[PDB]
Amino acid sequence: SYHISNLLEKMTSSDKDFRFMATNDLMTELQKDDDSERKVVKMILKLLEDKNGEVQNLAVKCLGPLVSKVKEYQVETIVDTLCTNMLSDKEQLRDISSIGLKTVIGELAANVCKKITGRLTSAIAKQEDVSVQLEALDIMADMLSRQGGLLVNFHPSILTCLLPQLTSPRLAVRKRTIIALGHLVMSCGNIVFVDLIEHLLSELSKNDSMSTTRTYIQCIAAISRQAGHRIGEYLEKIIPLVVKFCNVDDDELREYCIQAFESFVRRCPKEVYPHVSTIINICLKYLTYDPNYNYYSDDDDMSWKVRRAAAKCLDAVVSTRHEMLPEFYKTVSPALISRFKEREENVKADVFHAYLSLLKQTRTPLTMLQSQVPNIVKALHKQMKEKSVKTRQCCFNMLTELVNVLPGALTQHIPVLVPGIIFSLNDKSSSSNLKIDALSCLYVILCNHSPQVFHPHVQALVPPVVACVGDPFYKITSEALLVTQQLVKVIRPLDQPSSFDATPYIKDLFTCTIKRLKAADIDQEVKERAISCMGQIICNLGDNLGSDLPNTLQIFLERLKNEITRLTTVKALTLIAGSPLKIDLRPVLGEGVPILASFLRKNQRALKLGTLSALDILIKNYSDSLTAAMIDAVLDELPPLISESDMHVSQMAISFLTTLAKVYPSSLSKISGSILNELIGLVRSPLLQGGALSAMLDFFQALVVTGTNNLGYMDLLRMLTGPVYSQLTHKQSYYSIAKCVAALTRACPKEGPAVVGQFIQSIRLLALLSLGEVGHHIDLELKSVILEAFSSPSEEVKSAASYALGSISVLPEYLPFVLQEITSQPKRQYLLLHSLKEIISSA
Amino acid sequence: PSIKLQSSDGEIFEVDVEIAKQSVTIKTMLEDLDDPVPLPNVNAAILKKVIQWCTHHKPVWDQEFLKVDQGTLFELILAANYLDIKGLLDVTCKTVANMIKGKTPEEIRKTFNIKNDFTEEEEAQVRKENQW
């Protein structure tokens, strides 16, 4: 209690040394008190006018923590006294008050802003001291930026204050006034916006001076950029005015006009359509503007900004009007291409961006682009030799998009394009991103072009790529491996004949890939791409590797046991097992089969299809060495897989069994148990449809011919036909059973007695459907039996009978009979119509 | 939501789902297990009286209902214990206590149909102990 009153009394010691130290001590103490807070607040406020300079510094810098830890009411009075000090008659007092109030606002709330605004309006209005105006405008901008909605009733006042300041001699005042006006326009209201736009147009109407008109054009550009949709209503009156001032020979005036054009194009698409042609010609004319040039200074060149603005406006107009692509290719494109050589680096990026936007819009215009391709290459050839890193990235990005938009564009320009890429690759000055971009462009070029064109340049391409594989930086290695994978396809195609000798580079590619393969500690992306690249290498070129082949296969087999790289290894094995060149996978296969069989019970859908495809291809191409031990493990895990949960996996499983039955008939005795029962249960399912039917029908046709014990035509017929005779809520089950028994009958030629067997006879519907399905492609009293069965009380059987008769007819001895029976009686019309429709569909 | 209750006499009554939930035995029967449910001990008229009491309680009214003969009240007392209903059991207990309250001990033995089974010495000892 007494300690605080000691310092408060000491601060008036009339000695400059005492006041400084006392203020410092109190400020230190008041950092981590009921009625003494008012006294300390008032004393700190009074110290702002101290004669000594050092005391004022502490007074103004101690207002931070003071605001931080004092009751709420004292904040109101300190803010009020600072504001009323801002309007005083002393310059130093005004400056110190502004500096302090900045920090006071920094350390925070709704009411204080409303209190501040009323005084700050008159603070900005005064033009005696530009200094205080600067921070006053900054503070108003800060308040309008954050929580400016609550100040609705102050909008006309702040507007009427802000407009006159645009004529101030100091340019900083004009700039900060424009900044404040943008924030005001962000959310002000209809009445204020109308007045502001009307005043701006009226001021632009009379060209009082060149200095002011620049400020008005800048302000209208800013308001268009900020408001957006709100300005489009008045755009009709604005456009002629801004077009008129473009012709004036002023470098800085033109730039704001073009910026306003860009803002109008981007933010007001609806109202800018009539004047797009007018804007395009202006941008085209001013894009080349550079007076003191032809192909410790203080010149202060400003003509590069107008070119940059023109390029940006062309980008904006191109990226929005999709309709006028032919006009773009007719006019804009040659001008952009011609300006690929200009000196200034910044606007080069802008013209490249404009052309990239044009290409993206392109994705007939294609023919025009193809016609213009040679000029693009001629312009890029010189630019890829530039020493600037940023310039070459633009060229590579241009080429990558050009190849994507049309595949065979660069067919005639490989001899000139390749050396630039090679030079970029083996350059010490080049950066990592540049090499990544070069490799990405090379990969896209190689993918989309015929292998013939790259044959002469393989000798030049291989060493730099092999060197880039060995780079320490890991994404460079990934990109190099991806490029090498396609280079292997190019060097030795397999789907087309070739006469190119690929022997010299085989050792280089294998050596560069194997080092990355035998790492086990490198990044994941490098590992997967190394596995894929080595698989492709062995697939395309495997008869020349020789003694190195067996070890790489063991390395592949090692990767199957991992839980993160096994799927890629499965795909690599699938690829290598299906090459036209016969690769000896037998050493791996013996342990590979049990491991691949294990992946079936891992509830990961992506892995099951891959392992099923790998097993199918492996058994298809490498039957010669298959022991009974490995096949049983695969067969044992199948029954869980066949189900109605996922039909695709069941289809792949059925295809595997079909291939096994076709190729290795001995092991088929092992499916007499759970597998066959699960398959038969799946047949009755009501969700079965599509290619699953094809796979199922192929399986039975392949199986019945094998001739295994307990699996015969009679046994299979009884097993499929059992449930109907034993005691089926969906009609689809009957159709599936009929199609299956029809397939079995088609497989076995000696089935006529069986056909008569069901022809003699719920069971009737199944027999009729089976007879109809048997008659679908093979024709064997039947007409009389069908006619007798037509008149049945079951409507669902009548449709089945109608389908059975029609399919059986599908002919010389039945078509006229069916046609006559159609007109024979009116009752036999719907059935006759259905049979005729079925015959026509099956014709 | 229809439940049928059958009494000993064979009469079939009607009780609602939320009306029979007042009996703890019926509550358990509904809780943890088109036809009638026979109650071997629930009598003809007493079942109707119990149904009426349950509907009423879905005081002066307690006295009005229990203002019946002593034998009928005693018979209805067992009904509360059988159906496991607390309110009417407590009402019957209070009514019995009030009937016994304010009555001479000598005449209560004759009124309750209970023969006096005690000795003169035992009676004297009981009276001496009750001096407090």
Binding site: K175, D300, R601, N603 | Y82
Partner: protein, 702 residues
């Protein structure tokens, strides 16, 4: 009891049969109980013991069926039989509810504790008879099924939930749940995860281990909710964290350095997320980050070499690139943690104030000088007009760098001097940038320093207005105050003599009582030399103007010295500029040397800017301003010592040093020998003295 026991047993057998139960039979069975019980001395009649005996052998007969089953079958058997037993026991408790009403409650009231209700009796008999033999087998089956699930395969989740519920319900609370299942589960978790981590780290990279561990933790959290009790969250979470993250903190620390060497933001974020789970584990990461940033800063500065000593832009850009990269890393991967931003600040404050450049200059003051020169280069007129957006961001970044500089006074002095020179000569790229820079320096610096700059701008304004007004009365003239501007002060050529008097008269008439000292070393202009064999022009200084105007042939230096009264030291310097421009003929000079004019001078363009700064002027200026700063430092130190002694009468030496440093911390870091020397001088000035005894203590003396 016997009259109803047979029918009661027959009815109870129907309940346990788990079949259709007739509602009429239920009430008959209940009726039997009323007759059996009704006839203190409550009638128990050992019916409780009889039903206990009935329930005993039934469970033994049930156990005989499933005692020999394997792991797969025991789960299904236990689940089905437990569900059926629970339902049937509930029904039976419903049947015999009468006993619990009176006699079971009386037994507890009487104090005997060997009793339970019918449902509780059924549960206790189950626990005693069937649970005891089969608990180990059921737990082993559950553990094997869970281990199968952990390896990828799909398992039936309904079997385990029933076992967990049965274990929980048998606690009659979780006393039996923890003893029989949870301990074995946690031991199996230890055994599985230790081997999994050891095998996984040996083959796969450390980067994927973080993803594997976070996925495993999420899987455990989901699994416990799916088919386990909710009371094991914290236990399993902390145990799994201890198994996975804590054991491998050493390899995590080793990896962190490599992940710092090559930027991997997501990987660093994952490591931070994983390690944050362990309490008190992020400090060593902070130490590595600080050391790495320091080493990177010194390595980057050393790369530039001797060129960075005279090139401010490359030095500042190197520092800014390092700071921007590591600030992005801290704000993205480490989620703006206070410790990591502190580590960034500590490393920056060290590699900015001490590096290879400062060692070459032999002083730590070279960094603020280079910063000021970079700002001045940014804010001059060049061949290219800067963009508004790019300049503001660069100024913001410069202000960010300025915070870490311990010696701000050098920066303030150099910036003020360069701004004064820019204002006098009217070469500013953009005024808004200057206004923004002053607004920033207002918040970042003291009030006394900024008032000087405001005075210069006010003077420039009032002088531009004066010139504009005087133009109407009638060449540009600037008039400045004698205190605000840091400029320290020849025969006027007769060519411009008339303008001198014309301006002097107007200045005297508009305002009187003011003396105008004219400075000719800051005055520029353009030349019109007819005696040059060509019609050209050359921008030149006033000294260069007088030198060129005098020769309008060959002259001696002494003659020119007499003509213009220019000092020989500056005369040689101004003449060397003309000689270097190939506009004279006679590097060394002599007092009697004769200098002539090269007629027919050939140039690429007529407009030549010969106002090149002198060779030694920059170095002399730097040495002078460094000496001035060194002189100014002593006064502040002395004033601080005096004012701290004036309020605290007696104070110690170490406390004195600590207070002086915090007094002067916002301007520079004082050196201890300088403070000691200043104290010694103050003692010799009879401003304070040392008390007798109690050494290393000072007291104030008036």
């Amino acid at each position: 009891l016997d009259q109803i026991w047979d029918d009661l047993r027959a009815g109870i057998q129907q309940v346990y049969t788990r079949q259709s139960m007739a509602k009429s039979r239920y009430m008959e069975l209940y009726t039997h109980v009323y007759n059996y019980c009704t006839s203190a001395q409550f009638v128990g009649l050992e019916l409780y013991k009889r039903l206990k005996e009935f329930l005993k052998n039934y469970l033994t007969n049930l156990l005989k069926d499933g005692e020999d089953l394997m792991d797969e079958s025991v789960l299904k058997f236990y689940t089905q039989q437990w569900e059926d037993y629970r339902f049937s026991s509930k029904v039976l408790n419903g049947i015999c509810a009468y006993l619990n009403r009176h006699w079971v409650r009386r037994e507890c009231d009487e104090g005997r504790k060997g009793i339970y209700e019918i449902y509780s009796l059924a549960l206790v008999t189950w626990r005693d008879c069937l649970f005891r033999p089969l608990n180990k087998q059921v737990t082993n089956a559950v553990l094997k099924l869970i281990e199968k699930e952990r390896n990828g395969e799909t398992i039936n989740t309904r079997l385990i939930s029933g076992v967990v519920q049965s274990y929980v319900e048998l606690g009659l609370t979780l006393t039996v749940y923890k003893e029989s299942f949870e301990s074995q589960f946690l031991a199996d978790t230890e055994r599985f995860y230790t081997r999994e981590s050891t095998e996984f780290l040996q083959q796969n990279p450390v980067t994927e281990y973080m993803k594997k561990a976070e996925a495993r933790l999420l899987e455990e959290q989901r699994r416990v909710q799916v088919y386990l009790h909710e009371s094991t969250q914290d236990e399993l979470a902390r145990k799994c964290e201890q198994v996975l993250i804590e054991k491998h903190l050493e390899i995590f620390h080793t990896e962190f350095q490599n992940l710092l060497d090559a930027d991997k933001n997501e990987d660093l974020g994952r490591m931070y997320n994983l390690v944050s789970r362990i309490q008190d584990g992020l400090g060593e990461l902070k130490k590595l980050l600080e050391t790495h940033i320091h080493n990177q800063g010194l390595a980057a500065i050393e790369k530039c070499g001797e060129a960075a000593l005279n090139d401010p832009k490359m030095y500042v850009q190197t520092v800014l690139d390092v700071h921007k990269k590591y600030n992005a890393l801290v704000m993205s991967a480490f989620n703006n943690d206070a410790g990591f931003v502190a580590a960034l600040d500590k490393a920056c404050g060290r590699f900015i104030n001490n590096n290879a450049v400062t060692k070459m200059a032999q002083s730590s003051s070279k960094s603020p000088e280079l910063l000021a020169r970079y700002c001045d280069s940014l804010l001059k007129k060049s061949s290219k007009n800067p963009e508004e957006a790019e300049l503001e961001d660069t100024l913001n970044q410069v202000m960010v760098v300025f915070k870490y500089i311990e010696d701000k006074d050098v920066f303030q002095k150099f910036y003020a001097k360069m701004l004064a020179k820019r204002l006098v000569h009217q070469n500013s790229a953009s005024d808004d940038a200057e206004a923004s820079m002053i607004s920033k320096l207002k918040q970042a610096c003291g009030f006394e320093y900024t008032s000087k700059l405001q005075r210069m701008f006010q003077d420039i304004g009032v002088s531009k207005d004066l010139n504009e007004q005087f133009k109407k009365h009638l060449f540009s003239i600037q008039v400045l105050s004698s205190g605000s501007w840091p400029f320290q002060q020849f025969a006027l050529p007769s060519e411009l003599e008339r303008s001198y008097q014309r301006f002097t008269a107007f200045y005297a008439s508009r305002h009187s009582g003011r003396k105008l000292t004219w400075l000719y070393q800051l005055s520029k202009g353009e030349l019109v030399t007819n005696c040059f064999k060509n019609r050209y022009t050359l921008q030149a200084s006033t000294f260069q103007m007088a030198i060129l105007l005098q020769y309008n042939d060959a002259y001696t230096v002494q003659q020119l010295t007499d003509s213009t009264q220019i000092k020989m030291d500056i005369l040689a310097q101004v003449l060397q500029i003309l000689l270097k421009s190939k506009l004279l003929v006679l590097v060394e000079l002599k007092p009697d040397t004769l200098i002539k004019l090269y007629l027919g001078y050939k140039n690429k363009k007529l407009r030549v800017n010969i106002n090149v700064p002198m060779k030694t002027e920059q170095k002399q200026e730097q040495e002078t301003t460094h000496k001035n700063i060194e002189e100014d430092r002593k006064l502040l130190i002395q004033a601080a010592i005096v004012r701290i002694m004036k309020m605290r009468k007696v104070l110690k030496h170490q406390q004195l040093l600590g207070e002086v440093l915090t007094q002067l911390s916002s301007r520079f870091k004082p050196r201890v020998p300088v403070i000691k020397k200043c104290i010694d001088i103050l003692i010799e000035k009879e401003y304070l003295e040392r008390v007798d005894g109690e050494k290393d203590t000072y007291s104030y003396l008036a």
